[PDB]
């Protein structure tokens, strides 16, 4: 349609086309362009980013002479003058950090935040020394143990760290532990969080809260047969019962809190210190959780702030303030839960480091927030609520995906001098050695879909990749937190080189590391700057893959409505399996007595081991192993593009930690894989 619309869309950073996952160009419709535009909101710029050790030109506009003052983060001052319409160079050898430049003419001043960044993200010494490391990538909620309350928690993480470290592992990788909704416990996707600044309180180990043990009331309640029976049903279930587990924990912790609240000691001081230091961000998280709890008491279907009375939808309204003043103790309780979660996760980090693990804990940062959570309640202007983030139609998801997450407006991120991005990294790089960036292509572009539409109606919107990658490297170095990018799906060629030279580690998924005729890449040909995995939480387990269970189940759940396309996927899987089997034999991961014809073979321990040896033998500096594959599990934990159709984020591991680490087979497998890492 019109050129007005086309130019406008282009000026807004909306791509008029893109290369799809099959390599074919696709065009964006005028309707999409219109709907997405509707969704979006002087002498020097407000922010400038530079790489350290390079020249730093600053262009000045206007006219006449300007005086300038640059104050570094540590407080060093530099002065000069420059003519409007000219450029000047910043003082040489500025240190990396966050600096302030101010230009003045007559009375009025203009400020530029000046960011000086290293080129590469952080790497631990072990990796710099060219060691090949391994770790366990787990979904925390899936872990079973003798002590947990029916969901894997921070106590399980702590116990597991020791078992991984004793066997030569260097890290435990986690799903996102962002705050979800204790008032709607069944909204359990870690990737639709309330806020990416705070933590999921369901992971609190209540056994480790002293005040739980000191409460007479709590212990009388814990001792009830009813309580013990509810607990045993929750623990025995093969699927996490989020409602029961949350009620158990909230009930217990509320009684613990009544005890803690009367303390006048170091513990109380530490909690208050913590609260004072974290400031408004923490306060508003707690206020959100207290309000949400009250609202679901009035009506359980009140899922987030858009379903609340208008008076509570505006975070700044006088009755929100009144609610907070009248429910000071409820707000206090939710502050306390963030303190406990924080403290317990910190204890896990400390233990990982006591065990000399080069990475220790590997956190995950989700690519967005839920529309009706605390983050959007607090800073509505930042998010484009009339669009949703997803992914375009692709090979294994031909309908595409709509994740329902309102995207950050890229112009507001830069207009705030990257503050929201910076704070996100500071929150998520604490108490860990590596951070996974979910859907790392987001640094360059996100698939925005008009609200309420199917994914095929979306388009790619531009983000300022060069600035974001520099800032990421800077924050990585300052936290000594390495960065691993999930660069999977429909990936723009432009970003691949930039991620590499920024020192971001790629994911190499065994299933996909083959060419156009299913010849699999040799283990020695895996790039060093990557993590090799057999699979992820978004993909079938080894057994599921082999059995084509993902395709069969996907079909049943509505993911593959085109039979011809589906038939193609089955055919390609059988070809892939054969190519994989050939490679396992070719590079010495299977004995000669193992079968050579994939169609006549089922998943066996020999094959299971062979597949994991193949990636253990690779040149990838990191290896991520799933416990589900040590246990030979068939069922997936998550099916992308489903919400209600499958019990996502619920499938428990089939054995406790205690039982898995006493199993001869598991112990032999991990010893073998660890020896292959140290030989490669
Ligand atoms: C699942 C992955 O998909 C894409 O990569 C895939 C790709 O699609 C596939 O073809 C395949 O590509 C392969 C390809 O097959 C191969 O031939 C090629 O050679 O190589 C490719 C790999 O490079 O593999 C990739 C990696 O898995 C992506 O590029 C990748 O980044 C993503 N992984 C990560 C990203 C997210 C982001 O959230 C997570 O998604 C997860 O969380 C989402 C949000 O909770 C989940 O969304 C669900 O829940 C939402 C609430 C729900 N939304 C509703 C709810 C609400 C309110 O509540 C409303 O507002 C909405 O309007 C409503 O519709 C969503 O509809 C539903 O889909 C999602 O299903 C789940 O997977 C993943 O776990 C994470 O690891």
UniProtKB/Swiss-Prot annotation:
It is an enzyme of class 2 (transferase). It catalyses: Transfers a segment of a (1->4)-alpha-D-glucan to a new position in an acceptor, which may be glucose or a (1->4)-alpha-D-glucan. Signal peptide: none annotated. GO terms for biological process: glycogen biosynthetic process; glycogen catabolic process; maltose catabolic process. SUPFAM superfamilies: (Trans)glycosidases. Keywords: Carbohydrate metabolism, Cytoplasm, Glycosyltransferase, Transferase. It comes from the Bacteria. GO terms for molecular function: 4-alpha-glucanotransferase activity. It is found in: Cytoplasm. Its EC number is 2.4.1.25. InterPro entries: Glyco_hydro_77, Glycoside_hydrolase_SF, MalQ_N. GO terms for cellular component: cytosol. NCBIfam families: malQ, PRK11052.1. Belongs to the disproportionating enzyme family. This is 4-alpha-glucanotransferase.
């Amino acid at each position: 349609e019109s050129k007005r619309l086309d130019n406008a869309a282009l000026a807004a950073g909306i791509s008029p086309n893109y290369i799809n996952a099959h390599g074919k160009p696709q065009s964006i419709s005028a309707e999409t362009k219109r709907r997405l535009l509707d969704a979006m909101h002087t002498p020097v710029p407000n922010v400038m980013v530079y790489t350290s050790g390079k020249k730093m030109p600053m262009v000045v506009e206007g006219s006449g002479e300007y005086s300038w003052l640059l104050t570094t983060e540590e407080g060093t001052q530099y002065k000069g003058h420059v003519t409007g319409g000219k450029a000047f160079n910043l003082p040489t050898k500025l240190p990396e950090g966050y600096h302030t430049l101010t230009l003045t003419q007559d009375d009025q001043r203009a400020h530029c935040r000046v960011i000086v960044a290293p080129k590469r993200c952080y790497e631990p010494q072990a990796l710099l020394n060219k060691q090949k490391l391994w770790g366990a990538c787990v979904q925390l909620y899936t872990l079973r143990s003798e002590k947990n309350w029916g969901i894997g928690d921070f106590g399980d993480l702590k116990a597991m760290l020791v078992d991984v470290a004793k066997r030569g592992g260097s890290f435990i990788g986690l799903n996102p532990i962002h705050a979800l909704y204790p008032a709607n416990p069944e909204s359990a996707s870690p990737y639709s969080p309330s806020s990416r600044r705070w933590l999921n309180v369901i992971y609190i180990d209540v056994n480790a809260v002293e005040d739980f043990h000191l409460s007479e009331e709590a212990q009388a309640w814990w001792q009830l047969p009813t309580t013990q029976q509810t607990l045993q049903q929750a623990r025995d279930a093969d699927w996490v019962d989020y409602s029961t587990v949350t009620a158990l924990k909230m009930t217990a912790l509320r009684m613990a809190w009544k005890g803690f609240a009367q303390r006048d000691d170091e513990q109380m001081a530490a909690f208050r210190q913590f609260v004072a230091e974290q400031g408004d961000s923490l306060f508003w998280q707690a206020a959100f959780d207290a309000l949400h709890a009250q609202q679901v008491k009035e009506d359980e279907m009140r899922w987030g702030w858009p379903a609340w009375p208008e008076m509570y939808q505006n975070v700044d309204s006088p009755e929100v303030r009144q609610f907070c003043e009248e429910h000071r103790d409820d707000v206090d309780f939710y502050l306390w839960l963030q303190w406990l979660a924080y403290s317990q996760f910190a204890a896990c980090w400390e233990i990982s480091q006591g065990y000399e693990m080069p990475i220790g804990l590997y956190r995950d940062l989700a690519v967005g927030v839920a529309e009706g959570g605390a983050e959007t309640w607090c800073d509505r202007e930042l998010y484009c609520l009339k669009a949703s983030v997803g992914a375009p139609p692709d090979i294994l998801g031909p309908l595409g995906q709509n994740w329902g997450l309102p995207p950050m407006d890229p112009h507001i991120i830069t207009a705030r001098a990257y503050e929201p991005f910076i704070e996100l990294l500071r929150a998520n790089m604490q108490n860990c050695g590596a951070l996974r960036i979910d859907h790392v292509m987001s640094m360059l572009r996100l698939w925005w879909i008009p609200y309420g539409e199917t994914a095929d109606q979306g388009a790619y919107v531009h983000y300022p990749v060069d600035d974001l990658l520099s800032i990421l490297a800077l924050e990585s170095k300052r936290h000594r937190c390495m960065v691993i990018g999930e660069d999977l799906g429909t990936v723009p060629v432009e970003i691949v080189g930039k991620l590499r030279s920024s020192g971001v580690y790629s994911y190499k998924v065994l299933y996909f590391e083959n060419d156009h005729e299913k010849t699999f890449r040799a283990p020695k040909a895996y790039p060093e700057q990557s993590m090799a995995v057999a699979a992820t939480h978004d993909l079938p387990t080894l057994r599921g893959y082999w059995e084509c269970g993902d395709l069969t189940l996907g079909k049943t759940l509505g993911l593959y409505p085109d039979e011809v396309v589906l038939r193609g996927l089955y055919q390609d899987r059988e070809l892939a399996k054969q190519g994989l089997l050939d490679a396992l034999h070719k590079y010495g991961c299977l004995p000669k007595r193992a079968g050579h014809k994939a169609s006549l073979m089922s998943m066996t321990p020999t094959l299971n081991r062979g597949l994991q040896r193949y990636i253990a033998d690779s040149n990838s500096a990191l290896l991520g192993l799933q416990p589900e594959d040590w246990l030979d599990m068939a069922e997936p934990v998550n099916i992308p593009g489903t919400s209600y159709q499958y019990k996502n984020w619920r499938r428990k591991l089939s054995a406790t930690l205690e039982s898995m680490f006493a199993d001869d087979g598991v112990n032999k497998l991990l010893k073998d894989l660890d020896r292959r890492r140290r030989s490669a």
